[PDB]
A paper describes a structure:
Vinculin is composed of a N-terminal globular head domain, which consists of 4 α-helical bundles (D1-D4), that are connected to a C-terminal tail via a flexible hinge. The structures show that all vinculin variants consist of five helix-bundle domains four of which (D1-D4) form the vinculin head (Vh) that is connected through a long, partially unresolved, linker (“hinge”) to the fifth helical bundle (tail domain; Vt). In the closed conformer, Vt appears as a rod whose two ends bind to head domains D1 and D4, via residues conserved in vinculin and metavinculin; a small additional contact is made with D3.
In addition to comparing the energy required to open vinculin to that of vinculin-T12, we have created a novel variant of T12 termed T12-A974K, which contains an additional positive charge that might further destabilize head-to-tail interactions, leading to facilitated activation. Surprisingly, comparison of the new T12-A974K structure with the published structure of WT vinculin and of mVin indicated that despite the loss of 4 hydrogen bonds and the weakening of the remaining ones, the crystal structure clearly displayed a closed conformation. The T12 and T12-A974K mutation sites (residues D974, K975, R976 and R978) map to the Vt-D4 interface and hit hydrogen bonds that stabilize this interface (T974-N773, K975-E772 and R978-E775). The loss of these hydrogen bonds also leads to lengthening of hydrogen bonds between back-bone atoms in T12-A974K. Anchor residues N773 and E775 form hydrogen bonds to the side chains of D974 and R978, respectively; mutation of these residues to alanine would significantly weaken the Vt-D4 interactions in vinculin-T12 and vinculin-T12-A974K compared to native vinculin. The structure, however, shows that K974 does not form a hydrogen bond with D4; rather, hydrophobic contacts between the CH2 groups of K974 and the side chain of N773 are observed. The number of contacts involving K974 exceeds the number of contacts that A974 can make and together with the augmented positive potential it is possible that the Vt-D4 contact in vinculin-T12-A974K is stronger than in vinculin-T12. Interestingly, the C state of vinculin-T12-A974K persists longer than that of the T12 variant, but the SO state, detected at low voltage just like in T12, is considerably less stable, and occurs for only a narrow range of collision voltages, before the next transition to the O state takes place. Another interesting observation is that T12 expression in cells converts FAs to force independent, while T12-A974K exerts a nearly opposite effect - namely its destabilization of FA in Y27632 cells.
Numbering used by the authors: 1 to 397, 402 to 415, 463 to 835, 880 to 890, 895 to 1047, 1054 to 1066
Write the structure that this text describes.
């Protein structure tokens, strides 16, 4: 099994597999055509030289290495390489006498496959031991984080610190280089993110240890919260280091990453369900609470936490959570409706809601069954495969209950091969046990839903249905905040899409699927999705413009409620309230940011970033509250002040970058319409505030207006650092500068009217300044041959389904006139050929290798011209994003060439294929999908970068809506 996770392996294994492609090409020229095989002497000598380098440095390594694992795993590579090497040399010797020798060609096709396998295994052992070093350092730091609790003296604090130094420095350097030596870009992203999180967590660590030790040397009263924050820091840092250790051992795409994410989100739904369980169960059972209240929604969103669990369990276990969720949802609806009319406390208002909520305690129990279930499934999954199967697979050459412990929790060297077979079987069952998941960014969800609604191939891609369900769930989440327009976007559109999709499902499983009765209804559902996208982005924009207007005043009031004088009144009466409003504000911001990441127009990178910052703030709120409680506890103490300032600054910066990333995910002109609407509404509350003599309300509204104007100044300065032309830098700046001109006059005029609230001239001055701000924001807004067909042939196909998904996606646009759609069409066609060639095996070797070479060539065309597109385009975000989709193309093309050469050395269906040939088909399929859809995203985003010269993206199909 070949590997490609580093640039050194690739730089070594690409020319090797290339010369091997030559040798198997001449092998086919010999075996299929009976042609003279020429002087293999020079090429075999070059191969055996470039490989004898690896063998030589390896043999020198095993002498001077203290690594025992290397001493075990390295000589077998020496044998697997030397054998095939000498075998190829022998083939070169025999084919000098008789260039038609039938056993000399047996030794030519066995050695090339053997030199590929052996070379890959040898490099894999090197790499493996190189990482084992890095993991040795990481485990060093992990063990050093456990001795953090023994520090009780400032002497122990400084000593602990200075000794922690060198290991941290060495780890950071090692990871910074290893990530630069990796080919899988996502792995690099994970290493960078984790190491950055640890490095950003060190100062918080020494701060928490500092307040712990100052609180310990003296007899201060903040000892508990201090150890809470310190133990939390050890927890988070140790967890991130463990993430580093897991990623470092990855040699392919993420295979078991879904497990940990699914189980941690699974537990997150419950850790979040606890609090709202208590609160909502406590203050709903009251005889009335006006609907739309935050305490009312406190149940309506609880069920949402169950839904995200129901979307994680497989399609069958969805039963309990889905049916219970629907019944609880409709019975609470009746609670709100009945309680908000002339009749409350008719037993239907008590006896129904009571049995229901007593059932809320039941669906809160059903979700833990699936949560415990799945985990035991992941802990058993990794415990069997990793801890016993590998460890005693190595030690096959005694003691027993390792293979017993693996064999019990599941349900010579060929016996271990059977162990690998059954392991793959268990991984198959585990993989099926979980349902397919829709994308997270919007266009992925609506694209999968789109691919299911128009041609529902019966009983596959429940990913489209899952995308519709995730979109409808996100529409329910966006709706709970509204009031009047609450019913029109929720009831009509969300339930209309749920109903319509239920019609296209019941109308496809129990009946016919291709009739126009299901295709005339499909357009009824295809545009409804567009409606939910439009109004969902609209309501999301309105919600963001309100919730994210002020992100810092609650924690500011909490900061001044902590430094209150000791003789101040109601110190905890106001403090606990500031912490309550601070936790509520933080959670509200987090939820709004989640909706923004789900519905907004932003690439998956910024979606993962928004979710990451929401995770971080959600983790940071309680420790900020506890820091406020160790400052409020000890007045005049400098250490508590430094700690609370550190924590509060952490929260401030995380919510700041959260505000920015969330702002990226919104159509900025729609945002300007939203904030302009908010300035219109704010001024009405000002006229009213004057009419009823409310100067505090007036200055509050004016400060809100100036706040929004400054925010618009931020989003306007953002468009300056994004455009590379003063076409935008005098239009945007020429308006934002005047918007900055209009700010302060409105403020001082507001302060003027606040003292004489009924003076018509003063009021007139203030209002004039305000509407001048309004017009300024308005100006800021105003500143903004022929073709081929797919060779589908009648009856492997999973490799062709990707080729179809690219061909059907490339043909949507221009035939020619742009080399990228020509090259992508040709790539999907050549992939339709390669799918036919993989299960071939009769003169298909040269056609398959030549096919991979063609795919790599067209890939170079796409990458080249797309890189040309990126540098003649405004807004650097689209350019850099396009480059991000472009860099993952040449790597996957090269890996496609090498894998193709392996499959070619095993393509003459001469038998060495217990499952070894089945592996190379699967790797070619995985690589084929990743390449395929990678150039698909490169095509779509390539057109996005062409709306900004260069290409012509005119569409093919004639306009018919
Ligand atoms: Ca003035």
């Amino acid at each position: 099994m070949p590997v490609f996770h580093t640039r050194t392996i690739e730089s070594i294994l690409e020319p090797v597999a290339q010369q091997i492609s030559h040798l198997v090409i001449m092998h086919e020229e010999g075996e299929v055509d009976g042609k003279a095989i020429p002087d293999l002497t020079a090429p075999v000598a070059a191969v055996q030289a470039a490989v004898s380098n690896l063998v030589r440095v390896g043999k020198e390594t095993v002498q001077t290495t203290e690594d025992q694992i290397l001493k075990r795993d390295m000589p077998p590579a020496f044998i697997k390489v030397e054998n095939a090497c000498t075998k190829l040399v022998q083939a070169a010797q025999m084919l000098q006498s008789d260039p038609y020798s039938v056993p000399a060609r047996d030794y030519l096709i066995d050695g090339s496959r053997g030199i590929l396998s052996g070379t890959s295994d040898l490099l894999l052992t090197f790499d493996e031991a190189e990482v084992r070093k890095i993991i040795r350092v990481c485990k060093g730091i992990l063990e050093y984080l456990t001795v953090a609790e023994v520090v009780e003296t400032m002497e122990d604090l400084v000593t602990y610190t200075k000794n922690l130094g060198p290991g941290m420095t060495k780890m950071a350097k090692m990871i910074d280089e290893r990530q630069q030596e990796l080919t899988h870009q996502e792995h690099r992203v994970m290493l960078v993110n984790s190491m950055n999180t640890v490095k950003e967590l060190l100062p918080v660590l020494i701060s928490a240890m500092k307040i712990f030790v100052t609180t310990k040397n003296s007899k201060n009263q903040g000892i508990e919260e201090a150890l809470k924050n310190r133990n939390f820091t050890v927890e988070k840092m140790s967890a991130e280091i463990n993430e580093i250790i897991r990623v470092l051992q990855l040699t392919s795409w993420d295979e078991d990453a879904w497990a940990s994410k699914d189980t941690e989100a699974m537990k997150r739904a419950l850790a979040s369900i606890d609090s709202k369980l208590n609160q909502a169960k406590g203050w709903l059972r009251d005889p009335s609470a006006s609907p739309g209240d935050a305490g009312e929604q406190a149940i309506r969103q609880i069920l949402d936490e169950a839904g995200k669990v129901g979307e994680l369990c497989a399609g069958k276990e969805r039963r309990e959570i889905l049916g219970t969720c629907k019944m609880l949802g409709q019975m609470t609806d009746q609670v709100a409706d009945l309680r908000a009319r002339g009749q409350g406390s008719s037993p239907v208002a008590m006896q129904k809601a009571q049995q229901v909520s007593q059932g809320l305690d039941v669906l809160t129990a059903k979700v833990e069954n699936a949560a415990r279930k799945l985990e035991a499934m992941t802990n058993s999954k990794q415990s069997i495969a990793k801890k016993i199967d590998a460890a005693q697979n190595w030690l096959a050459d005694p003691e027993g209950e390792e293979q017993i412990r693996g064999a019990l929790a599941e349900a010579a060297k060929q016996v271990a091969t059977a162990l690998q077979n059954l392991q793959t079987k268990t991984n198959r069952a585990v993989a099926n046990s979980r349902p397919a998941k829709a994308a997270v960014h919007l266009e992925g969800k609506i694209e999968q839903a789109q691919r299911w609604i128009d041609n529902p191939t019966v009983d596959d891609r429940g990913v489209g249905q899952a995308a519709i369900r995730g979109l409808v769930a996100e529409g329910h989440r966006l709706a709970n905040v509204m009031m009047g327009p609450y019913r029109q976007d929720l009831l009509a559109k969300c339930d209309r899409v749920d109903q319509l999709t239920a019609q296209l499902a019941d109308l496809a499983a129990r009946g016919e699927g291709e009739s126009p009765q299901a295709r005339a209804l499909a357009s009824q559902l295809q545009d409804s999705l567009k409606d939910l996208k439009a109004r969902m982005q609209e309501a999301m924009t309105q919600e963001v413009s309100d919730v994210f207007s002020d992100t810092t005043t609650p924690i500011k009031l909490l900061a001044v409620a902590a430094t209150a004088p000791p003789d101040a009144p109601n110190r905890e009466e106001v403090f606990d309230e500031r912490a309550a409003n601070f936790e509520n504000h933080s959670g509200k911001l987090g939820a709004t940011a989640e909706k923004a990441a789900a519905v907004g127009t932003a690439n998956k990178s910024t979606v993962e970033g928004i979710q990451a910052s929401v995770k971080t703030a959600r983790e940071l709120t309680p420790q900020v509250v506890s820091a406020a409680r160790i400052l409020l506890r000890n007045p005049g103490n400098q250490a508590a002040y430094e700690h609370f300032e550190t924590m509060k600054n952490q929260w401030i910066d995380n919510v700041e970058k959260m505000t920015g990333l969330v702002d990226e995910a919104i159509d900025t002109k729609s945002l300007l319409d939203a904030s302009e609407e908010a300035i219109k509404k704010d001024l009405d509350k000002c006229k009213v505030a004057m009419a009823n003599i409310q100067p505090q309300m007036l200055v509050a509204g004016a400060t809100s207006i100036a706040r929004r104007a400054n925010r618009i100044l931020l989003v306007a300065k953002r468009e300056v650092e994004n455009s590379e032309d003063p076409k935008f830098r005098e239009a945007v700046k020429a308006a934002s500068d005047e918007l900055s001109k209009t700010i302060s006059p409105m403020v001082m005029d507001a302060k003027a009217v606040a003292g004489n609230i009924s003076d018509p001239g003063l009021q007139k001055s203030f209002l004039d300044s305000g509407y001048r701000i309004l017009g300024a924001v308005a100006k800021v807004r105003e500143a903004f041959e022929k073709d081929e067909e797919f060779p589908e042939q009648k009856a492997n196909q999973p490799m062709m389904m990707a080729a179809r998904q690219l061909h059907d996606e490339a043909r949507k646009w221009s035939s020619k006139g742009n080399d990228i759609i020509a090259a992508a069409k040709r790539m999907a066609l050549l992939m339709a050929e390669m799918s036919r060639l993989v299960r071939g095996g009769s003169g298909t070797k040269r056609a398959l290798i030549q096919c991979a070479k063609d795919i790599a060539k067209a890939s170079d065309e796409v990458t080249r011209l797309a890189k040309e597109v990126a540098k003649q385009c405004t807004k650097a975000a689209i350019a850099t994003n396009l480059l991000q989709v472009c860099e993952r193309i040449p790597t996957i093309s090269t890996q496609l060439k090498i894998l193709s050469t392996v499959k070619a050395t095993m393509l003459g269906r001469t038998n060495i294929s217990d499952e070894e040939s089945e592996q190379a088909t699967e790797m070619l399929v995985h690589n084929a999908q990743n390449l395929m859809q990678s150039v698909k995203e490169t095509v779509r985003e390539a057109e996005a970068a062409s709306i900004k010269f260069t290409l012509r993206w005119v569409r093919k199909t004639p306009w018919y809506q």
